[PDB]
Scaffold this active site. Sequence first.
Site, mmCIF file in Angstrom:
data_model
loop_
_atom_site.group_PDB
_atom_site.id
_atom_site.type_symbol
_atom_site.label_atom_id
_atom_site.label_comp_id
_atom_site.label_asym_id
_atom_site.label_seq_id
_atom_site.Cartn_x
_atom_site.Cartn_y
_atom_site.Cartn_z
ATOM 1 N N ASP A 120 0.777 -1.188 0.000
ATOM 2 C CA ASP A 120 0.000 0.000 0.000
ATOM 3 C C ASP A 120 0.838 1.281 0.000
ATOM 4 O O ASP A 120 1.995 1.265 0.431
ATOM 5 C CB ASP A 120 -0.928 -0.073 1.212
ATOM 6 C CG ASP A 120 -2.106 0.851 1.102
ATOM 7 O OD1 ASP A 120 -2.232 1.559 0.074
ATOM 8 O OD2 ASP A 120 -2.900 0.884 2.064
ATOM 9 N N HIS B 183 2.419 4.590 -9.427
ATOM 10 C CA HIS B 183 2.385 3.209 -9.859
ATOM 11 C C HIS B 183 3.663 2.828 -10.585
ATOM 12 O O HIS B 183 4.212 1.724 -10.390
ATOM 13 C CB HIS B 183 1.119 2.948 -10.689
ATOM 14 C CG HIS B 183 -0.098 2.709 -9.844
ATOM 15 N ND1 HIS B 183 -0.047 2.014 -8.646
ATOM 16 C CD2 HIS B 183 -1.384 3.118 -9.982
ATOM 17 C CE1 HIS B 183 -1.242 2.020 -8.076
ATOM 18 N NE2 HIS B 183 -2.071 2.685 -8.867
ATOM 19 N N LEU C 199 13.604 -18.496 -5.931
ATOM 20 C CA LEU C 199 12.461 -17.911 -5.282
ATOM 21 C C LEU C 199 11.146 -18.276 -5.966
ATOM 22 O O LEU C 199 11.054 -18.286 -7.194
ATOM 23 C CB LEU C 199 12.590 -16.395 -5.308
ATOM 24 C CG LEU C 199 11.395 -15.587 -4.757
ATOM 25 C CD1 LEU C 199 11.366 -15.653 -3.176
ATOM 26 C CD2 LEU C 199 11.588 -14.160 -5.197
#
Lengths: 227, 220
Positions: free
Chosen positions: B10, B27, B117
């Site tokens: 957030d 963004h 990962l």
Amino acid sequence: LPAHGCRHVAIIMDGNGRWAKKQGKIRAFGHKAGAKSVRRAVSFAANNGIEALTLYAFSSENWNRPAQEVSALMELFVWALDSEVKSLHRHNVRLRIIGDTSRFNSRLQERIRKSEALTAGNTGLTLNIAANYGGRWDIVQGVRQLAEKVQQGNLQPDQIDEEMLNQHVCMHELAPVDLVIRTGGEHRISNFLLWQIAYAELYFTDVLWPDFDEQDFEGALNAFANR
Amino acid sequence: GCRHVAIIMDGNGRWAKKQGKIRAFGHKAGAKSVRRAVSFAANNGIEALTLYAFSSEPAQEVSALMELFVWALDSEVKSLHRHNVRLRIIGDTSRFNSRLQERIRKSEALTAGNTGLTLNIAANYGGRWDIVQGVRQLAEKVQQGNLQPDQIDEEMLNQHVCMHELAPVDLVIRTGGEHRISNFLLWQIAYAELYFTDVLWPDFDEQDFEGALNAFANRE
Ligand SMILES: CC(C)=CCC/C(C)=C/CC/C(C)=C/COP(=O)(O)OP(=O)(O)O
Ligand SMILES: CC(C)=CCC/C(C)=C/CC/C(C)=C/COP(=O)(O)OP(=O)(O)O
């Protein structure tokens, strides 16, 4: 409608042991002091317009701890039921126990059953004591209820939605959980409420539960009101 | 040892407003942060990194978003691959157009064999929705008569929730200042360490990420 605007508070009451050890005292003294703290919080909530207070009393995982630690807790639970219920009632407090009560001995079940009944029609604060409780278990029970409706032929799998399961988890009948408070320093839910805390404010304090008082409760409500 | 980290990213919008720019700028910055976090997780041995992209929560701007997802996959998958990362998308994707679903399948297909990962991208994901999907599965078996309601238990249901095949989530990080899970993972965070920070996502860096692992290392 009170100013803090919080309707349902949930509490993970951790720190009792650590509280007693800081003092050179045994585990039991922290439990004594923790119970005072529960009396103080319950009273605070009934006096500050809270609709529901849900306290994390005994987790389903706790059963796996030293007998002296399990039985003490059980001992205290039995003590609360046998001796603090009349006061909840005189406060128009509605008492619910949440969690797998089936595991308790039939005598503890009978005390639970009578305490809830005595107070079922009360209209003030709803006090939910989570005993032999877990968030996952809670979800699992609402699932079986639904499965069951599927079995009897009244429910179609494709019809099961969020709202339906939300109606079969514990406390579906109360205002949603607005605020989760955890004393004692640890930052985790520990399988307390999970389904119900999707939108709850999470509030962690290092204050040990026996030291968590009315001013700390206001603190937490005020931090919430400022969200 | 923190094996699985989950992040609620957030703060992009507030970071934009704060810089004096339009939301799209925050963004771009946020995207740059995802890249920085994915690398850090990879260079640090974390085995699973789950990122909360967009919640179930203009029929046009959704389209521009489905196209962004496509853009992102097309531009970033080769790199995830070189970096030996396994990509997985969790969430309700039946809803995506055919092209994006296939693009998601080829990307997972392309990286399934990677051994570094595991990066989980939660798209159109909801913690409650996740549990509900498992429940519906279970319900189906009951309808066919192969499962009694009484036989459903946590372990069984857990096998029907997202990421049950991976290491349990150990740490949930939420940047941005809010102190909520917001219907992100629910079933999966029962025992996870919860870490909240005021740092806005675009600003969240290597040190913030280490601070979080530190907060985890210090849990009792
Ligand atoms: C019936 C009822 C619910 C009464 C309330 C009394 C009350 C608050 C009892 C404490 C229970 C508890 C979690 C004890 C274990 O110590 P600890 O884990 O709290 O502390 P620690 O981390 O420092 O060891
Ligand atoms: C399992 C279980 C039953 C748990 C709850 C245990 C517990 C300590 C509840 C508190 C009840 C309460 C606020 C009483 C007030 O004291 P009071 O009625 O003595 O009168 P007062 O407000 O004037 O002090």
